[PDB]
Each structure stands twice: as structure tokens, then as C-alpha cells.
Amino acid sequence: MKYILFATAGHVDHGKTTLIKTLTGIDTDRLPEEKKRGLSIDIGFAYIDFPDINTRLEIIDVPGHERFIKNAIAGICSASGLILVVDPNEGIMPQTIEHLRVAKSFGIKHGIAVLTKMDKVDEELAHIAEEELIAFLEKEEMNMEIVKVSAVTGQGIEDLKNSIKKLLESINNLNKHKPLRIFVDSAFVVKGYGTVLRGSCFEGEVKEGDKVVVEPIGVISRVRKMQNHGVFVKKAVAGERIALNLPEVDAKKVKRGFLILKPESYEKSNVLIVKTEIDLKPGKIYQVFFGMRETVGKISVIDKGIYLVRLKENAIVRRGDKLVVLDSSGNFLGGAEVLHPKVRVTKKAFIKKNIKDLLENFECYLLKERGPIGLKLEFFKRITGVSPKVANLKPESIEIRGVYYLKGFIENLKLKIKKFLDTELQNAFGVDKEKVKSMFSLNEELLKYILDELKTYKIVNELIIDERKSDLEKNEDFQKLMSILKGGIKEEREIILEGIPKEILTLSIKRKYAHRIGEYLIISDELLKKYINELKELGKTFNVQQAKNKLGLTRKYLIPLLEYLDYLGLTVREGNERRWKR
């Protein structure tokens, strides 16, 4: 079935809870402190089922009084639609206004306005109240079918069930396919099961047996069982209020605001780029609300409509998410759209220069935030919740070995590389591949392609060199090696210790001046040839011992050498002796 969450907003004592108890059949406040007073104290839960559309409407009833809006803002955060309640006898009150604005700030677009207590109101006031309300709702750009009900009479509670159903059918639940994200409203411990977290599944779906992360604290846990309204279930979905069994999590360390999350599907940060209508003064500090969690943050103006947020506490948000801002004192101020969470740059300049990109092509703003890195699609989807647009990359960028590199920054460095190299090779025989990292970080993905493009440079061992091929023979260390090689076959250890560098060695072997014979014997090409000719003087008749006498070598050097002649193809080890290949 389909799951949708609605919140109920409304001014205090306007009939919120009483209505839900009659709509759902569920006492929203079931905690006694209500029933003696007659007031809801905190976030409460119920649900209506619509069999004909196969939809469970998940309902969070909110508390009225202004003293409770911290609660209120939390309930409303995750809803898709608002059940706004107005008492005609009172008309439209500031909690009526605040809750609606709040809902608007959180990006809620859908709703039913309820004129309640029709049993306590004569037809006229009913009518003027409705008019008032209509005016109000378009004034706030929040048009809602208005239903007139009496929670008590039961009057057109039906016709409310009607309008809700009509509305639900007009909704699509995009979140079902975003990465799992669940806001936690409670945590507790159940005998025989362990820690349970209860919460509003906001994006994604989660199955029994999935590993998830509780993310202020970072505990990983296999969903052992879970239940939706007292009944065990094996799958939960965005919309559903779900209880998850997560034993690994010390419930006493968990409040609201905690996330349940598909592991490695998010990023923390204390730095955001946002969008508000508000102008936010850098000095005074504002409360920021989201995911049933309050945080506090200082503001730095980047442009107008665009602000930088530094947050007291690291924080899990995605591009597009919406925030509610409160004054120091706790009155409503507005809403904010997270344009970018975890920015690299806090200096204004960079941001204002690519706003036009930041707003309509996030990929290309990302390719800018750090270009050489490139952009993994797996990453875009951790800040966005969505994989990139193949287009927004395509004409701009061309990818390599998986990662996306905007065609721009490649040519920027080829200049910086080649200009550095040639000036470096001016007084040296080369440069550390690591010395490149001092400025370049790790280009190992693409350094190859940089040098695959710049034909001139090849990398040898610990070393980067320009192709200077007649430059080996005028290298002193080379000539040293070549002279030390006149003393017969040498061992790489001695050679290495006489202090000729590996680069010169391997280069010498590459370019056919010396050869490797054992795994560690090294022989000049000159002496190789000399031995070969000396071996040839035996005819093609050619036993092991006959070579030891001809060449004067100990088996320590002979056997790897013959083994090499075999490798080259010069000789064929046909059992006892060897012969010269045609």
C-alpha cells in the first residue's frame, strides 16, 4: 500500500487532537497530563487507511501553544501535507499563521483546511469564518480545500475523509527512491528485542536485515525486526512511520533528530550555502530547524538570496532540503533552501562568481569547487540524493577511468606541469613523482594521461625524465656503471651500494646497454656479446662444463647467463647440452 504523512497545524484549543481522535479513531494524546488539562503536550501519532486507494495516511498531530513550537516544527518537518485547523469562533490566530508559514517554509504544498466545531457555531459565523479563511489561504499562497466539520456531531467528517482521499491521490511520493533517510522521534528498549528507534521515514525504503547507520553517534546496525503501528513488517517506505530494532545502539544516548541512514549515502558538514528571502544579520545568531532537530548558526552574506552558514554542530543535509529559521528569542523568521552542504570555500568571491552555475548546473559548480579530483557520480548522489544529469557533464566534460573531469582544468596544468618539469630538468636528471604531489596532490589517475599526451615525458622508477636519449651516455653515473661493469658480471647489491642510482640502472638495462641475468646479476651488453662469441667457439656442441671452461665462470654466474641465452632464443636447452637457434 501507499504511505503518506500529514501533519496537523492549528491554533491552540482549536480542535486539532479532538478531530484526529474522530477521524482516525486514535487518541493522539494518550498521556494523562492531557486528559486532565485538555491539551496536547508534544508530537502525537495516528493514521487513517483508505482501502479504495490502498493508502495509509500517517498523521502527526501537533501541539498548539506557542511554548511548544519547537515540538511543532519537528512534527511538520517531514510531512507532505498539512491538516490546518481553524476554530470559527476564534477565526485565524497567530499559531494558525505560524504553523502554516512553517509548513510553507518546509516546502509543503498540499493540504485541507478544517473549520472545526461546527456544532458550536451558527451558520453565519461559519460563513464569515470560511471567507476570512479563504482570503487568508490565498494571501499565503497556500490554497486548500476547506471542509467544515464537527468532530463531535460527526458532521461531514465523512466529507473530510473524502477530500483527504481526493488529495492523496494527487501526490506521487518521489522520496520512495531517494537514499534511505529516517528522522528519529523516539528511542526506547523493548524486553526480548533490545533498543528500538521509532521514526518518520522521510526518503528511501528499508528492509528487515538491512544494515543502517544511526548518525549523530555513527553506530552501524542490522535491522533485526521492525513494526508499523504495532504490527511487524519486513519493508518500510518513505511516508511510513516505522519502529526499527537496533540493539547495537544505546537508546539512552538517542533523542529526536537522530538519523537512520543507508551507510555511506551522506556527508557531514558545518558549512552550507543557502537561499532565503530573509536578510540575516551576521551578529545575532539564529536557530535552524530540520529533520526534527534544532541547530544554531552564524551567517555570512555571499550575495542577496544567498547566505553562508557556519553551524555549531556538524550536520547531515542534502541539496534541496529546506530549513526553518528562528530568532534568538524563538519567533518565526522564514525558511531556507540548502543550495550546497559541505562547501570547500568560505571566501565569498568564489561563490558569487559561479552562482549562475551553482543554481542551474550543480555538476559544473562542483567541477569548479575542485576540478582535478574530478567528480564521481557516486558522490553527487550523496549531496543531492540524485545521480547527475548526463547532459550537465557531457559537452563540458570528458571522463577517464570512471571519474568525470571537466575539459577545462586538464589544459590548465599541462602548462604548469611542462613548465615546471623543463625548468627542473635544467639542473637535474629528473624529478620525484612525489615532488609533483607538493602542489598537485595525487594525479595518479590522470598523470598517466597528462604524460600520455605530452609524448616527451616518461616516468622511470622514483623518477620523471624528459626523453634525452644521448643524455645517458653523458651521464657520469652511467659511465661509472659502464666502467664498473668492465669488471665482469656484477651483483645489483654492489652496484646499488657503489651508489649508482636505480634509474640509471634500469634505463641502462632498458636501452640494451646492460642486462639482468640472475634476479640480481647485471651484465653489460658488451660483455654479454663477448661471452656469446666465446661460447660459439665450441661449435654447436655445447655442454654445461664446456662453457665453465671457456668462460671461466662459476655456476653462480654461468647458469643464470645460459638461462638468459635460452630466454633470448640464442640457445635451446635440449637436455644435456645447448645449440644455436637458426
Ligand X SMILES: Nc1nc2c(ncn2[C@@H]2O[C@H](COP(=O)(O)OP(=O)(O)NP(=O)(O)O)[C@@H](O)[C@H]2O)c(=O)[nH]1
Residues near Mg ion (CB under 5 A): 16-17, 40
CA distance 27 to 44: 9
| 129, amino acid identity | A
- Stretch of 6-14, 317-325, 474-482, 566-574 lying at the interface with ligand X (CB under 6 A): 6-14
Q: Is 342 in the site for ligand X (CB under 6 A)?
A: no
CA distance 341 to 278: 19
Among ligand X, Mg ion, none, what does residue 198 contact (CB within 5–8 Å per kind)? none
* 17 marked among binding-site residues: yes
C-beta of 66 vs 337, nearer to ligand X: 66
CA distance 165 to 54: 10
C-beta of 23 vs 236, nearer to ligand X: 23
Q: Which of 18, 265, 276, 392 binds ligand X (CB under 6 A)?
A: 18
Q: Are 238 and 203 spatial neighbours (Cβ–Cβ below 8 Å)? A: yes
CA distance 382 to 268: 10
State the minimum distance, in angstroms, from the CB of residue 63 to Mg ion.
6
Question: Which CA distances in Å does 363 have to 395, 568, 578?
Answer: 12, 54, 66
Q: Is 13 in the site for ligand X (CB under 6 A)?
A: yes
Q: Is 16 in the site for ligand X (CB under 6 A)?
A: yes
Among positions 49-68, residues that touch ligand X (CB under 6 A) are 63-65
Among ligand X, Mg ion, none, what does residue 138 contact (CB within 5–8 Å per kind)? none
Among positions 84-143, residues that touch ligand X (CB under 6 A) are 116-117, 119-120
State the minimum distance, in angstroms, from the CB of residue 134 to Mg ion.
25
Q: Are 296 and 312 spatial neighbours (Cβ–Cβ below 8 Å)? A: yes
C-beta of 95 vs 265, nearer to ligand X: 95
State the minimum distance, in angstroms, from the CB of residue 82 to ligand X.
14
Among Mg ion, ligand X, none, what does residue 268 contact (CB within 5–8 Å per kind)? none
Among ligand X, Mg ion, none, what does residue 120 contact (CB within 5–8 Å per kind)? ligand X
State the minimum distance, in angstroms, from the CB of residue 40 to ligand X.
3
Q: Which of 39, 146, 233, 425 binds ligand X (CB under 6 A)?
A: 39
CA distance 561 to 346: 65
Could you tell me how many residues of this chain bind ligand X (CB under 6 A)? 21
CA distance 30 to 503: 80
State the minimum distance, in angstroms, from the CB of residue 30 to ligand X.
13
Among positions 135-164, residues that touch ligand X (CB under 6 A) are 150-152
Among ligand X, Mg ion, none, what does residue 13 contact (CB within 5–8 Å per kind)? ligand X
Among Mg ion, ligand X, none, what does residue 163 contact (CB within 5–8 Å per kind)? none
Nearest to 71 by CA among 79, 80, 83, 63: 63
First to last CA, the chain: 81
Close Cβ partners of 414 (under 8 Å, ≥ 6 residues apart):
450, 453, 454
311-344 b/e with 16+ CB inside 10 Å = b? beeebbbbbebbbbbbeeeeebbbbbbbbbbbbe
State the minimum distance, in angstroms, from the CB of residue 17 to Mg ion.
4
C-beta of 114 vs 521, nearer to ligand X: 114
Question: Which CA distances in Å does 147 have to 9, 81, 129, 157, 297?
Answer: 15, 15, 12, 9, 40
Find where cell 533552501 sits.
337
Mark the binding-site residues for Mg(2+), compressed into ranges: 17, 40, 61
Give the annotated binding-site residues. Answer: 17, 40, 61
Residues of the shown chain interacting with ligand X in the complex, contacts defined by CB under 6 A: 10, 12-18, 38-40, 63-65, 116-117, 119-120, 150-152
